[PDB]
Design a protein around this ligand. Structure first.
Ligand SMILES: [Mg+2]
Ligand SMILES: [Mg+2]
Ligand SMILES: [Mg+2]
Ligand SMILES: [Mg+2]
Ligand SMILES: [Mg+2]
Ligand SMILES: [Mg+2]
Ligand SMILES: [Mg+2]
Ligand SMILES: [Mg+2]
Ligand SMILES: [Mg+2]
Ligand SMILES: [Mg+2]
Ligand SMILES: [Mg+2]
Ligand SMILES: [Mg+2]
Ligand SMILES: [Mg+2]
Ligand SMILES: [Mg+2]
Ligand SMILES: [Mg+2]
Ligand SMILES: [Mg+2]
Ligand SMILES: [Mg+2]
Ligand SMILES: [Mg+2]
Ligand SMILES: [Mg+2]
Ligand SMILES: [Mg+2]
Ligand SMILES: [Mg+2]
Ligand SMILES: [Mg+2]
Ligand SMILES: [Mg+2]
Ligand SMILES: [Mg+2]
Ligand SMILES: [Mg+2]
Ligand SMILES: [Mg+2]
Ligand SMILES: [Mg+2]
Ligand SMILES: [Mg+2]
Ligand SMILES: [Mg+2]
Ligand SMILES: [Mg+2]
Ligand SMILES: [Mg+2]
Ligand SMILES: [Mg+2]
Ligand SMILES: [Mg+2]
Ligand SMILES: [Mg+2]
Ligand SMILES: [Mg+2]
Ligand SMILES: [Mg+2]
Ligand SMILES: [Mg+2]
Ligand SMILES: [Mg+2]
Ligand SMILES: [Mg+2]
Ligand SMILES: [Mg+2]
Ligand SMILES: [Mg+2]
Ligand SMILES: [Mg+2]
Ligand SMILES: [Mg+2]
Ligand SMILES: [Mg+2]
Ligand SMILES: [Mg+2]
Lengths: 86, 82, 80, 205
RNA sequence: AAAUUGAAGAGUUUGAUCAUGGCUCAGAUUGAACGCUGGCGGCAGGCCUAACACAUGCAAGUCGAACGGUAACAGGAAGAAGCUUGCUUCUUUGCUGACGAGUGGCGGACGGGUGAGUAAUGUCUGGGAAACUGCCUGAUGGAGGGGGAUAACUACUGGAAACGGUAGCUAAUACCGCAUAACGUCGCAAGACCAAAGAGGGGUACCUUCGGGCCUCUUGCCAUCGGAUGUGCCCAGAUGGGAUUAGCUAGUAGGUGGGGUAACGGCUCACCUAGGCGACGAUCCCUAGCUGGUCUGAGAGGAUGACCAGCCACACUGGAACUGAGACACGGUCCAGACUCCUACGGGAGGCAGCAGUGGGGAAUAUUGCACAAUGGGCGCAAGCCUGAUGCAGCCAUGCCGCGUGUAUGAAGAAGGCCUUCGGGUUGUAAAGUACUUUCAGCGGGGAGGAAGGGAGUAAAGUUAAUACCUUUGCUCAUUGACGUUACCCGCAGAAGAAGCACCGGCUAACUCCGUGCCAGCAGCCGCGGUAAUACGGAGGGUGCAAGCGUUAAUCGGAAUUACUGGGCGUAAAGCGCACGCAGGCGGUUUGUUAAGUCAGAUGUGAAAUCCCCGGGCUCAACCUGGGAACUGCAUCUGAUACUGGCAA
């Protein structure tokens, strides 16, 4: 890039991209674990995974990696499925 | 940020500023929410040099609009003249 | 108190939905002769209670499908 | 931007006195007024209605020293104004500063009055006005400036002024060389051989 | 009170007439181009064609009051020396004023450009709910205690360069935990869970490791709920041409459920149902950015969308995501392509549809200008810095408006030219001469206004422990203008520096002579020209416009010649060969009811500018501007029930 601020913005955007990718992948991993627990049908294991997942999505939403609405939607969906499970 | 500022239309070497309330991002002589008076720097001294609808100005200021230095100067000068 | 349209059901072969035709008089823009114009709207019909030809009262709502944005408030007359 | 050529030629073409000379001398002692200018002036033209309309417009224009563009704008303004279109056109024409100066008699002719206006010799409300087409309004005071009041031509012109008919709607004090435009002149007080309705037709053909 | 007041025809078919009918002209307007000519000023305007390619220089930075620091310059402090004894000199010391590079915060998503695409994912009008919203603003509370790094830097090192690579070092308002938690999120509840950052100014005492702690003020950070602004989304109507395009559509149409989004949603899936659109024109093709508006028109309309403003789309072509409140991003990233360029041939760089400018295309469209003084915009406590936005200047008669190019007198009707039936007539008061003035240009002198502010001191009121600091309010001082030698005013000189273009057969205002001889030539149509041509060319005279005038191109008008207002069809162009008949259009008469159409009233809205009315300011006008009318519409509500419609009889 030709402009001085443009170069620095590109560098900062790459750094932020790597940090955000790490944290977002962590959150998605913890969600997919509870989805696999649901697909295995154990209420207890899925509840353990859900109550460990809950504090992390709220913190990432508060830190701006995702929206509060997205975190709340995830919590609502998982609670719905877990309660609807036998 | 809502701001109260002057939209200079006038003519060459004969400016006639129009006090307008607008989003600060829009261009100067562009989209404005509401006009609240006028100011003519050149004055015959028998004309109305500045007219300000202070009530609507206060309404928007209370809502949270900021004020350009020149609009604040105009408001202060008219209230001082009164 | 609520904006509303009135029309007749022209087709009900869809699951939980119906298409209603709203007809109105409009003065022709140039010539002037009042001409009938029709607007067909895909309407949401829970319970599929509307038969073809029925006259139904409709109101606008949120998008319910790709095309459905109106819901049936009441049936006015049915099975003419 | 102004007609500078011979003046009596226009009067000969229009077939009447246009007051393009001071008047001190009878115009028939200065030219063959009753004959059209040119090699074939003696022949008489069987003139069409369009011809007579054009001749009427040209007569008024050459009386007031106004060119076609300015006269067209005057007609547009008169048509816009409320009331009889021809009458307000005549009022607008008679409201020119040079015409007012000539009526008050500071110039022997409208051209001399126009030169007086142009050369910073006329004041309106104590302000120097140098534009010929300045519209004078009722209750205006037009005065000769002190510095230009000693010009011999104005003191000469006041005699011709007192020898022609005195307009009703102007009050002129010749001693102080100041005058008051009391009111806009009506149709009846100015000459009745101007067929303004011909001009109204010409600007609607 | 006012918001209108408003409409012209002519030539041409025939031996002559009336009609039908086409062609042509007279009017305005232009982002105009060309030809002849050309003084000044004000305002406005200036690649419509190649979104063709681009040399060069500028168009996005800012904060030391977030931080580590000191490369540079200015100090100081130590510090010896030249030696004049401190007049300087070298050397450290980020100790100070500040600041290159760097981390970090905010801003590059605004401002500016263009109209390729787009016939509806767009725009205009009117509605709506299922959403977000940096900075701004109101309220309510918090603001605890830790941790591991990484730039900068140093060392080594690859490459021609671009750009890198390995190893150590340091900091924060960078990053990550842990504590804390409701009116916040999830849930029916029960509960569960979730955050933060300091910095600056001053300081009575008091403690102190002399750093500070501590008090106070200002600003900053976190959470929730609002306000406003902006944005995303949904519906209806409107929004070109073609029917020598009649059928189109399988995520297509709907449903259940899962997933995804800030949000509803075939947005995406899995399955089920087999639908959806269309003659009220779907689909397909061609063409085109839309609107307020502009030109024209009496009006309805026709055309049009330059400049100003609102909206959309694009940023070499195609595609994609990331950061972020906001982009799938003009002067950001990655990939592909065509180009152009650097080379060590391995590799790389670039995107004027930003401002000037170059080449090219074309009939045709300008300066590689000055300034941040005013209005805004970004950062900042502020000073201030940046700003080809903007304010101004330069170029052009491109348009509109104004002004001058002299005024008066002047018959010997001079001379000369032209005509002459030879007497004269005409150019013509025209000139000359004789009087007068000096606008504008030229020279000299004065001089507004665009300037508000900001900085320093003072004083008073807050302030709190504090007459500190800071905020507000005064008062005092010296200052801030690109334009600019400004507008404007005063003085000098001298009529002195300044008039062209088209036409003259009829339409259409203005006529003769000479030359020419159906040749040369003219022409918008009718038409001219073959021996006296008012039509060709020259002269004299005249007519119309005027610093312009003519020619061409394009739109409306005239054109009632797409006729809705406002036309026709026996013979002039025009009644299908005839009948039935579906969709569609219309429908006898009475009563009731309905309020759909219709009418009345009210509300909201119809952005600003433009048009119009009454005024105001530039010496007038153009131009700028105040208030109003208007924007004939759309939607909602309450009324009227004659007419049309629905229903009933
Ligand atoms: Mg002019
Ligand atoms: Mg242009
Ligand atoms: Mg720095
Ligand atoms: Mg823009
Ligand atoms: Mg902490
Ligand atoms: Mg550290
Ligand atoms: Mg916690
Ligand atoms: Mg933090
Ligand atoms: Mg259009
Ligand atoms: Mg669903
Ligand atoms: Mg949808
Ligand atoms: Mg196009
Ligand atoms: Mg018409
Ligand atoms: Mg885009
Ligand atoms: Mg290009
Ligand atoms: Mg691209
Ligand atoms: Mg993001
Ligand atoms: Mg882009
Ligand atoms: Mg950008
Ligand atoms: Mg560029
Ligand atoms: Mg350019
Ligand atoms: Mg060329
Ligand atoms: Mg500035
Ligand atoms: Mg710069
Ligand atoms: Mg600059
Ligand atoms: Mg002679
Ligand atoms: Mg001068
Ligand atoms: Mg000043
Ligand atoms: Mg004639
Ligand atoms: Mg001959
Ligand atoms: Mg000819
Ligand atoms: Mg001859
Ligand atoms: Mg000829
Ligand atoms: Mg033409
Ligand atoms: Mg017509
Ligand atoms: Mg006919
Ligand atoms: Mg026939
Ligand atoms: Mg028949
Ligand atoms: Mg019927
Ligand atoms: Mg009936
Ligand atoms: Mg109704
Ligand atoms: Mg408006
Ligand atoms: Mg005035
Ligand atoms: Mg106004
Ligand atoms: Mg009825």
């Amino acid at each position: 890039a030709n402009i001085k601020s443009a170069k620095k913005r590109a560098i900062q955007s790459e750094k932020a991209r790597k940090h955000n990718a790490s944290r977002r992948s962590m959150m998605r991993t913890f969600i997919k674990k509870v989805y696999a627990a649901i697909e295995a049908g154990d209420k207890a294991a899925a509840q353990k995974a859900f109550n460990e997942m809950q504090p992390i999505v709220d913190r990432q939403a508060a830190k701006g990696l995702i929206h509060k609405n997205k975190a709340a939607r995830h919590k609502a969906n998982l609670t719905a499925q877990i309660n609807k499970l036998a | 940020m809502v701001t109260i500022r002057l939209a200079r239309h006038g003519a060459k070497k004969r400016p006639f500023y129009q006090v307008v309330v607008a989003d600060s991002r829009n261009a100067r002589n562009g989209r404005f929410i509401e006009r609240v008076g006028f100011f003519n720097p050149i004055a015959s001294e028998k004309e109305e040099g500045t007219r300000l609808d202070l009530d609507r100005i206060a309404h928007w200021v209370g809502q949270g609009a900021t004020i350009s230095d020149r609009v604040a100067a105009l408001i202060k000068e008219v209230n001082k003249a009164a | 108190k609520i904006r509303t349209l009135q029309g007749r059901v022209v087709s009900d072969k869809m699951e939980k939905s119906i298409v209603v035709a709203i007809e109105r008089f409009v003065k022709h823009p140039i010539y002037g002769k009042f001409i009938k114009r029709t607007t067909k709207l895909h309407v949401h019909d829970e319970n599929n209670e509307c038969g073809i030809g029925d006259v139904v009262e409709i109101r606008e709502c949120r998008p319910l499908s790709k095309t459905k944005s109106w819901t049936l408030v009441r049936v006015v007359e049915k099975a003419v | 931007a102004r007609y500078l050529g011979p003046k009596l030629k226009l009067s000969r073409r229009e077939g009447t006195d246009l007051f393009l000379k001071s008047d001190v001398r009878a115009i028939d002692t200065k030219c063959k007024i009753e004959q059209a200018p040119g090699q074939h002036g003696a022949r008489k033209p069987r003139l069409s209605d369009y011809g007579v309309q054009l001749r009427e417009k040209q007569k008024v224009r050459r009386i007031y020293g106004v060119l076609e563009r300015q006269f067209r704008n005057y007609y547009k303004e008169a048509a816009r104004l409320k009331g009889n279109t021809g009458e307000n056109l005549l009022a607008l024409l008679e409201g020119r500063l040079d015409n007012v100066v000539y009526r008050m008699g500071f110039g022997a002719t409208r051209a001399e009055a126009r030169q007086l206006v142009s050369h910073k010799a006329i004041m309106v409300n104590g302000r120097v006005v140098n534009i010929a087409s300045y519209q004078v309004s009722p209750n205006d005071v037009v005065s000769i400036r002190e510095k230009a009041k000693k010009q011999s031509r104005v003191k000469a012109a006041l005699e011709l002024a007192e020898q022609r008919e005195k307009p009703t709607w102007l009050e002129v004090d010749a001693g102080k060389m100041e005058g008051t435009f009391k009111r806009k002149p009506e149709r009846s007080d100015l000459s009745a051989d101007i067929n303004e309705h011909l001009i109204v037709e010409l600007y609607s053909k």
